[PDB]
Amino acid sequence: MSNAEAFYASIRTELESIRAAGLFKNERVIATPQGARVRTTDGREVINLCANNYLGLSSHPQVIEAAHEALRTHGFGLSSVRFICGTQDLHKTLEARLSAFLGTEDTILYGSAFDANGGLFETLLGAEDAVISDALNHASIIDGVRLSKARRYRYQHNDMDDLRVQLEQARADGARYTLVFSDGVFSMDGTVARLDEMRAICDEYGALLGIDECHATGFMGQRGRGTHEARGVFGKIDIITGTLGAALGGASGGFTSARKEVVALLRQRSRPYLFSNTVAPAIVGASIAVLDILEASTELRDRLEGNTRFFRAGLDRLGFDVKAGDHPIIPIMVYDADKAQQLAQRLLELGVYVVGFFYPVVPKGQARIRVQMSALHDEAALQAALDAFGQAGRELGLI
Amino acid sequence: MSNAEAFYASIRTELESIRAAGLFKNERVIATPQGARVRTTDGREVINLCANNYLGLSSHPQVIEAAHEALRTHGFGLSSVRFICGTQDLHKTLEARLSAFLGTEDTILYGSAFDANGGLFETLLGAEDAVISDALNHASIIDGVRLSKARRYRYQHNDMDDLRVQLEQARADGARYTLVFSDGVFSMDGTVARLDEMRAICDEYGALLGIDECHATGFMGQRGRGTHEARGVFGKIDIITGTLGAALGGASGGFTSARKEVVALLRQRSRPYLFSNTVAPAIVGASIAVLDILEASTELRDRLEGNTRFFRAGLDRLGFDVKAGDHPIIPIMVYDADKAQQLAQRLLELGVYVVGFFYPVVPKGQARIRVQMSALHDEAALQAALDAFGQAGRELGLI
Numbered sequence A, B: 001m002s003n004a005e006a007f008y009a010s011i012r013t014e015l016e017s018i019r020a021a022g023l024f025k026n027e028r029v030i031a032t033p034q035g036a037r038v039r040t041t042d043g044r045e046v047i048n049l050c051a052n053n054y055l056g057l058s059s060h061p062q063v064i065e066a067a068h069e070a071l072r073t074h075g076f077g078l079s080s081v082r083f084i085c086g087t088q089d090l091h092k093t094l095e096a097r098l099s100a101f102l103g104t105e106d107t108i109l110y111g112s113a114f115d116a117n118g119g120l121f122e123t124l125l126g127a128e129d130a131v132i133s134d135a136l137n138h139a140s141i142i143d144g145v146r147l148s149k150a151r152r153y154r155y156q157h158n159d160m161d162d163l164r165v166q167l168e169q170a171r172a173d174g175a176r177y178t179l180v181f182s183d184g185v186f187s188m189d190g191t192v193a194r195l196d197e198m199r200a201i202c203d204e205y206g207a208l209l210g211i212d213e214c215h216a217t218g219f220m221g222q223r224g225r226g227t228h229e230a231r232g233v234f235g236k237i238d239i240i241t242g243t244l245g246a247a248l249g250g251a252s253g254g255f256t257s258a259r260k261e262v263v264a265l266l267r268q269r270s271r272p273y274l275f276s277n278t279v280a281p282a283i284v285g286a287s288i289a290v291l292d293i294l295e296a297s298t299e300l301r302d303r304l305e306g307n308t309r310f311f312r313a314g315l316d317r318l319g320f321d322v323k324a325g326d327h328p329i330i331p332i333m334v335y336d337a338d339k340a341q342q343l344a345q346r347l348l349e350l351g352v353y354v355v356g357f358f359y360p361v362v363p364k365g366q367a368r369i370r371v372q373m374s375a376l377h378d379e380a381a382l383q384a385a386l387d388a389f390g391q392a393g394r395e396l397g398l399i
């Protein structure tokens, strides 16, 4: 046995253990555009209830047409980072429009929200500084923090008292600048960070407040500006990182939105911005069309909150443990990972497309289906899916 | 004076410090698609010699048309990670086509090569293991390694004796598995890793061999398959990370190519694959077309080789320290940062678009112009470029 082939055996052993634990993820091959209804390669049409396509913009024909026109005017790829020959007029326009949309001075585009978080903390903070994360922060945030030299603190999920505890220990530890950072809306449980309280706590200690808005931008808040609008702290946020790949088009891209001087240091120093490709022209162009759509009417936002309020009441009535208000992320807890695999595959047989969340995506013993509402869903599909959840929820002992 | 505002003052001071040092980067706003000639929003049309558009596919009409078709048949965004509802038949087809193109059993798509590198080492290696890196490895590789718990060794740039020294030490320090990782072609100086020697040196120690192929795929090797083809080690590479945003279209996306079990574990466990958007349908479809073009004929990479040997030989006869031929990346050292921005500015006035390279993109005191060849250039442009380089070169003291 050679070391290299030994290595491949440890990999194959690891892959076999993951199956045995029921934790192996199987990809489903979709044959159609993203949509509230979708078809797999077997030709079966099913209701998609697990997409980040909150506002239906992923296949919106005006967004689609703006991609066609940006290809015509501005080409397919740029094959360059921003500071060389990857900045088109489109990127500057989109950054201006996102900053106005979000209430910030400026905005810097990244290839993904993952890389915005990746290149944020190491650029702005040093060994003398502290970052203090909600314990449930998205993986991209944790890895961005791990790449920084900052001192790290974690506070219990949504626990404003533990947040005060950590800011005390961080100040005691001699922190110079302190950044409190959290998902605006949490990926896996739908809860909404208490930004109004956190803005107050931050001011008291003099800490910066940064949020990750991937699951808020476009629909949270009366005008879909984000969690900070819904919490009454619009214009009061130090750092917004976010994605173009959820409600704002779904294709690719991310951003950091902040005061002008923060954004300016990120262009000069942030590693993903210096060393990774610019957002593709058709993407930037369609994102500008997305902002025109959402600033013209809150209808899509309102429709989402409506469908959500409907489908949440529905799951309440059936005996599922869902709070039943608004929150387009409806986490249906099943704890056991094998149950989650069963429920996902039973619901697929009854014409509903959802997917099992289990470790390492969610913690062990806390498996779940993450149901995700879209503004696309019509009452027929909504009522249809409730029947599939009621039936499958009874066949497998959940209600 | 509040802590928050003092932080912003720090950022402002640092920006100012960057500008005083001659290290502040200013983006130029291009109003046109990417191509051999380009026009900025001030109307001036100029010769582009600093794109990653090595094969000219960034605005190739068949690549633009495939992206058009994919928008029609498969939509704009998927707004989902792969294991949920972000997998279309296109992603499976491109992963298959790429594996065949590169000589590997399977491929896993990422949002970028930056993320492919970011999600590799932490998923495959542990604290018991070792990574040995060429000292000039790309920032994305260093960042991926930093995120893993493996022990880190560096060998001197392209120094095969030092690599053996590190392989001994890593063995003497008790490494379980050892992965030797390197740029295929190096970002900032165009040198080509000595994969033939390294595959042999790796084999002595049973170390793995991994390569970052961003500046190679499409055009390195007789059939353009990679640096490994060019060194006669095709099919003998444990790990290939690489991009779709350079020679292969220039829009977005990246990949890791490896044996079936590595790729399978990357799907199960790689954080950017789990937690960041799938590649957009238009980019995957246009990528499948890109491989159709490059597998039908070698003319584009052949015209790239010609354009390079002509231009490298031309700058040599002009007195530039440039050397030989065949390396599409032509570094032109100026050392001083100011001299780098001046040279780039003077070349713009003479009708050539290049950009100064300086810290932190390259080391302090080692500023350069990174000329980059494309297959797109006619000899009238390459000749007008040479005249522009001879004039600006002798005006600023370079020749």
Ligand SMILES: Cc1ncc(COP(=O)(O)O)c(CNCC(=O)O)c1O
Residues within 6 Å of the ligand: A080, A081, A275, A276, A277, A278, B052, B112, B113, B114, B115, B117, B138, B140, B183, B185, B187, B212, B213, B214, B215, B242, B243, B244, B245, B253, B254
């Ligand atoms: C060696 C290397 N690796 C990874 C990346 C990241 O690629 P993506 O664009 O796919 O993230 C780059 C980008 N380098 C761009 C340049 O040299 O200008 C690179 O040069």
Ligand SMILES: Cc1ncc(COP(=O)(O)O)c(CNCC(=O)O)c1O
Residues within 6 Å of the ligand: A052, A111, A112, A113, A114, A115, A138, A140, A183, A185, A186, A187, A212, A213, A214, A215, A242, A243, A244, A245, A253, A254, B080, B081, B084, B275, B276, B277, B278
């Ligand atoms: C809070 C949060 N932050 C960052 C990211 C990364 O975004 P990009 O896809 O732009 O890299 C995600 C992805 N979330 C995927 C999901 O919830 O299924 C997220 O949920």
